[PDB]
Copies of this chain bind each other. A is one copy, B any other.
Amino acid sequence: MKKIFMMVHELDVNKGGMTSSMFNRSKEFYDADIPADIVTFDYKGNYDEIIKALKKQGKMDRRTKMYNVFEYFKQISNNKHFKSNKLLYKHISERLKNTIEIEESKGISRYFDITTGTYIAYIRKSKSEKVIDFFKDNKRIERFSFIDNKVHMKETFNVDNKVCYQVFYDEKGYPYISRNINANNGAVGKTYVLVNKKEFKNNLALCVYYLEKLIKDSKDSIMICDGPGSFPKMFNTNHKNAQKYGVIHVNHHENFDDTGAFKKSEKYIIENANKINGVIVLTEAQRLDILNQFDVENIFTISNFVKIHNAPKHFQTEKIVGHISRMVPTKRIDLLIEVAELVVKKDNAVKFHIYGEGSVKDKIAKMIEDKNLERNVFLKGYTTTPQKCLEDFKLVVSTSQYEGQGLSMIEAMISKRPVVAFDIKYGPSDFIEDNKNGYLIENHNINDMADKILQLVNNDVLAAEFGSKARENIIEKYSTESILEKWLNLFNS
């Protein structure tokens, strides 16, 4: 009779990392007969289309449900009214009355008052979505947003033409919620639930009320909070029986901080660990780190569930070294190019395939040019099928300075590909057996890493032996049955 609620601010088709885990964690719990659903706290006029696509693409399980604060009230409003809000559509159409249309593109058209030449409206049609912008004294003041010719949301714009206020509409066109938006930072202020004629300080206020309405105050109701920003939404509920857990997915220490600083959102979760049921960390290393620095004891280690897909038909014999990750400073791809340069000198043959995109994509691209490794290092860009990429690698390398567990390397080892990576906080140390299933390089030692890639990339015997021992290892440690038992013990306690 247990029921899990996993919290994250939003869900999207592009969005990854944490969501991927949550999606899979939901499959496992649903398989274990504990419905584990996702709760989001954002507005999306097309959430149905997003979820429908996520499930079609097989990223999200068919069983997994997504609860959303704004949809919750939208349903109350849908049930409350019976005829369409004809007066709203009449208001919109009346505004566009004695006007002349000046087409700019296909969908794009502008509307000017025939009697005065005043600029009235801008309209942009686009398959299913239509946008109507209303002007006043030559400045856009409003934006009516339609999906399938039915309005779902209206926005008011300030002097700097920036959203200062939102209004969401139900399936009949009636307004159910409105809210002030800080134009500068985009922060959500006073939220007005027009359907219930109730005011809320901020969105947090609203979601706290919502979670109290959604989740039954039973010891059987479990709240796992993945998204660290969503933590106080959970933490602030009046629930006295329902269980509250928080999951830390990243190394809690502020990245590139010799001062010993902590990540704001994470620090807050860790600090309150005794005030809730528990704080879940992925590695046992992180658990001890937290217990040492903080005067709190409700910290627990529960690894991510691991998807044990079938290993490729055959090993890669060619000297191809791979890496699949987001292009961000924490991943230190800058160091990867420095190792790549050291490797290609001692052996010209070996090629490096770097999949991914982000901020540092440009810096790394220019870095290859200067180091003259254009014929060896190839930035293969974004990938949608990363499992198919793994088939083509002899070994996977990771320069990452900061990690939570490094599931990416774990996922590589299942595909019988050995990992040569820097021993960092946190993860590699747990699953990489140095000189057995891959190489656990001492941090920053680019010369040692270069030597070990050359060793492994040249011997086809080692690459196959270390790769097979890598999969055998993950299967042993990361047993899905046991990780589930770990959770159950924690819930039933």
Instruction: Enumerate chain A interface residues (CB-CB to B < 8 A).
Output: 85, 87-88, 91, 100-104, 110, 112, 114-119, 136-139, 141-142, 154, 156-159, 164-165, 167, 169, 175, 177-178, 180, 192, 194, 197-199
Interface contact B102-A115, CB-CB below 8 Å = no
Chain B nearest CB: distance from A170 CB in Å?
A: 11
Question: How many of these chains are in the complex?
Answer: 3
Contact among B104, B116, B175, B197 with A116 in the assembled complex (CB-CB below 8 Å)? B175
Q: Which residue of B lies closest to A180 (CB)?
A: B138
Q: Which residues of B contact A194 (CB under 8 A)?
A: 100, 102, 112, 117
Q: Which residues of B contact A164 (CB under 8 A)?
A: 137-139
Q: Which residue of B lies closest to A197 (CB)?
A: B102
Q: A192-B102, A192-B112, A199-B102 are in contact. Are A119 and B85 (CB under 8 A)?
A: no
Cα–Cα, bound, A198→B101 (Å) = 9
23 of the cross-chain contacts (CB-CB < 8 Å) are: A85-B115, A91-B116, A100-B194, A101-B197, A102-B192, A102-B197, A102-B199, A103-B197, A104-B199, A112-B175, A112-B192, A114-B175, A116-B154, A117-B167, A117-B169, A117-B177, A137-B142, A137-B156, A137-B164, A138-B156, A138-B165, A139-B164, A159-B159
Chain B nearest CB: distance from A122 CB in Å?
A: 11
Interface contact B178-A117, CB-CB below 8 Å = yes
Q: Which residues of B contact A154 (CB under 8 A)?
A: 116-117
Cα–Cα, bound, A163→B180 (Å) = 22
Cα–Cα, bound, A334→B200 (Å) = 48
Chain B nearest CB: distance from A350 CB in Å?
A: 50
Q: Which 10 residue pairs across A and B have the least CB separation, nearest first?
A: A117-B175, A117-B167, A138-B165, A117-B178, A87-B115, A138-B156, A137-B141, A138-B164, A102-B197, A102-B199
**Most B C-beta atoms less than 10 A away, residue of A112, A137, A180:** A137
Q: Which residues of B contact A159 (CB under 8 A)?
A: 159
Chain B nearest CB: distance from A469 CB in Å?
A: 63
Cα–Cα, bound, A159→B158 (Å) = 9
Interface contact A88-B115, CB-CB below 8 Å = yes
Chain B nearest CB: distance from A199 CB in Å?
A: 5
Chain B nearest CB: distance from A12 CB in Å?
A: 26
Cα–Cα, bound, A87→B117 (Å) = 12
Interface contact A178-B87, CB-CB below 8 Å = no
Q: Which residues of B contact A167 (CB under 8 A)?
A: 116-118
Q: Which residues of B contact A103 (CB under 8 A)?
A: 197, 199
Cα–Cα, bound, A165→B118 (Å) = 9
Q: Which residues of B contact A156 (CB under 8 A)?
A: 137-138
- Extra contacts, 7 of them, besides A85-B115, A138-B158, A159-B159 (Cβ < 8 A), are A101-B197, A114-B175, A118-B167, A119-B178, A138-B156, A138-B180, A139-B164
Contact among B85, B110, B165, B180 with A192 in the assembled complex (CB-CB below 8 Å)? B110
Q: Which residues of B contact A136 (CB under 8 A)?
A: 137
Chain B nearest CB: distance from A89 CB in Å?
A: 10
Cα–Cα, bound, A90→B142 (Å) = 28
Cα–Cα, bound, A104→B102 (Å) = 43
Cα–Cα, bound, A117→B101 (Å) = 28
Q: Which residue of B lies closest to A193 (CB)?
A: B102
Q: Which residues of B contact A100 (CB under 8 A)?
A: 194, 197
**Most B C-beta atoms less than 10 A away, residue of A116, A158, A178, A192:** A116
